[PDB]
Amino acid sequence: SIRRTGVKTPASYGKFVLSKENAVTAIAHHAIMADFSQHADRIQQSSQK
Amino acid sequence: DTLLDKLLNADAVNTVLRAVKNTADAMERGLIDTFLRVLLRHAPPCFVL
16 A cells, blocks of 8 residues: 655745835734735725635 | 844944944034033133133
């Protein structure tokens, strides 16, 4: 049942980025909400999409 | 730099430059101060003069 097979694997690391917004957020009240502009477009759209 | 270092570094730069800039201000105003105080210590009053 054990079959030797080449499995695709990531050859690099993921990244966590701090936005222009998000640095001012972490300065302002010492927290980050991840994916902020992807929240804010939902804000100016209908909210919970 | 994932950009949160960059504000901190440029604020270190701004703090050092504003320190030297207000330092030159303090040097000029202290020159004003001690020049005025030397004129006070070398100026007799009008009822003497």
